[PDB]
């Protein structure tokens, strides 16, 4: 084939890269809907960006005007309550979808070779989402907003030699005042574009090494083009997600939040129950469970170290959980542990929740510490079960 005269626009250089990577990318023929969850997370990110821009057309980053500006958006702006509820509940759905993404990856062991770079870029993406959502939640400037900012920024003092200096520098002036508000608005506006860049790199690395499948096996025998076969599957996922998200926006918009964020920030009194948003609760529970706050920060760093250390395991030959009963049970126990851990974080430090959290976090790390053992034993399996 010499391309003398042009046949198809899709194969022209203007649409050639897009053609390959969107229409013609070969995909395993047996993918279920969790790959749809990955695409759905992308859509949630785009929704957040658009609604955030149109919200920032009305938000004043000053300490004396932020709360009343948000109430302006809700009451005066034409269809502004829709924008604000979409932004908040869209942050929530973004985190829900990313959690389902991560747990599918864990179940099917997609972190294994050769997708170590994909998993690591995913971990970086998760860090960026955490930071962006936190600094954004500081913006409305309520009781929960101000006090959560105070606590989570002041736990950065646990660094041995330069903790206090970093805390003061990040605060900008001995407290979490107007300077911190402007700082957080600028950072919240900036970070989503770095998040878009990270997502693009994530997808590029995956596209380099293909895509896993529910069997975990080599899958270059039966492969089909992405369009239209997986576009329609993703479309079904998107419409179902739209119905879910519309249930949340219109009928129960304040269920996923706390009522203390509707009181203007008053640094004098302290609300009796200071907790982050529901999607930071597992991390908050781990950190609160391990005492000696320096130990808590070290434990969070250890959580991310374990997450980054999953891909680089030794044998781990069989990949999918469909052929790993022990690992299947371990994964389900880990998921139950994560849900319980998230529930613990909303409870006070009074007993027995301290014991329950100190057990749950230990079980979390135990999952992360017993996967190589299963891999080694499984590597030992084939020379024992032979039927002859």
């Amino acid at each position: 084939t010499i391309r003398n005269q042009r046949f198809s626009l899709l194969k022209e250089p203007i649409s050639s890269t897009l053609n390959q990577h969107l229409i013609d990318y070969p995909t395993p023929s047996n993918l279920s809907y969790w790959w749809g969850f990955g695409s759905l997370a992308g859509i949630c990110l785009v929704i957040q960006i658009v609604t955030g821009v149109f919200l920032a057309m009305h938000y004043t980053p000053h300490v004396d005007l932020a709360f009343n500006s948000v109430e302006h958006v809700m009451r005066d702006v034409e269809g502004g309550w829709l924008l604000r509820y979409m932004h908040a509940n869209g942050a929530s759905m973004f985190f829900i979808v990313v959690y389902l993404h991560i747990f599918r990856g864990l179940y099917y062991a997609s972190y294994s070779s050769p997708r170590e770079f994909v998993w690591c870029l995913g971990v970086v993406i998760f860090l960026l989402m955490i930071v962006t959502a936190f600094t954004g939640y500081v913006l409305p400037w309520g009781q929960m907003s101000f006090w959560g900012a105070t606590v989570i920024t002041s736990l950065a003092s646990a660094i041995p030699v330069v903790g206090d200096t970093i805390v003061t520098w990040l605060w900008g002036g001995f407290s979490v005042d107007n300077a911190t508000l402007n700082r957080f608005f600028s950072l919240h506006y900036l970070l989503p574009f770095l998040l878009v860049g990270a997502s693009l790199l994530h997808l590029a690395a995956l596209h380099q090494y293909g895509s896993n499948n529910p069997l975990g096996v080599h899958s270059e025998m039966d492969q089909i083009s992405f369009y239209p076969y997986f576009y329609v599957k993703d479309l079904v996922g998107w419409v179902a997600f739209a119905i879910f998200f519309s249930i949340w926006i219109f009928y129960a918009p304040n269920v996923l939040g706390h009522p203390d964020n509707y009181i203007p920030a008053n640094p004098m009194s302290t609300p009796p129950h200071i907790v982050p948003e529901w999607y930071f609760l597992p991390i908050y529970a781990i950190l609160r469970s391990i005492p000696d706050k320096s130990g808590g920060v070290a434990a969070i760093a250890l959580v991310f170290i374990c997450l980054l250390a999953l891909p680089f395991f030794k044998s781990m030959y069989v990949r999918s959980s469909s052929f790993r009963p022990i690992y299947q049970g371990i994964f389900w126990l880990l998921l139950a542990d994560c849900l319980l851990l998230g529930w613990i974080g909303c409870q006070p430090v009074e007993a027995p929740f301290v014991t329950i959290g100190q057990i749950s976090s230990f079980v979390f790390f135990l999952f992360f510490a017993i996967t190589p053992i299963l891999g080694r034993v499984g590597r030992g399996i084939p020379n024992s079960y032979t039927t002859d």
């Binding site: 089909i224 329609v232 419409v239 009928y251 509707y262 009181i263």
Partner: protein, 244 residues
Amino acid sequence: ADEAEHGLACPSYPWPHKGILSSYDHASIRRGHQVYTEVCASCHSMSLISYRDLVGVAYTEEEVKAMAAEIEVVDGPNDEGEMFTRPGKLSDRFPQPYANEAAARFANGGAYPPDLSLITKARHNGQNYVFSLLTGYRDPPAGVSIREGLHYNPYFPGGAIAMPKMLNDGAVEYEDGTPATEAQMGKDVVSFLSWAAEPEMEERKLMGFKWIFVLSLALLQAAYYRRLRWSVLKSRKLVLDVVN
């Protein structure tokens, strides 16, 4: 102890504006605004609601104009730099009873009567909590004698609240002759407060119903589309030259 600290739990009352197709009782909103103006505006403030917010919701435009013309507000400098007071217009927010938080606390014994604009969204189980708080001024239990200068209220965290029992039988004279009792006054004021915290509830509910229905139909279409496009693949027969 902990029980009194977290307060007696509030029941689940059947509010008229509860349900996927349920609107505010606008007569009750009007009645609640009356009771708030009569008894609650002496200490509490709203400061987030304009008089124009009442137009088409509980009052007619001329009525709101007259009500605004009743009160007087300070307007900016004139051609001499001095300040002056003019009757309120249809855009001014509800008047504030106290100069600032310090004056409010000084007038109310150090306790600050909270702003009531978002009161039902600033408490857990907002509307039920507010109704129960207003109605449940009960005799304190045995051997729990609270200090002078407060009142016992089981729902309030700690049991001791700073405002006195305000809603009394016959406190106000309703315009439409509705018999004023404590429960009725509480219901009306909580309906008004819940409207104030969320004036978009009806439009939001209508949009939600319409779009959930429409998107459900879209979901059926998308499922059919996916099945149709995948049916040349799922109903296929392949011969592979292998057995075991």
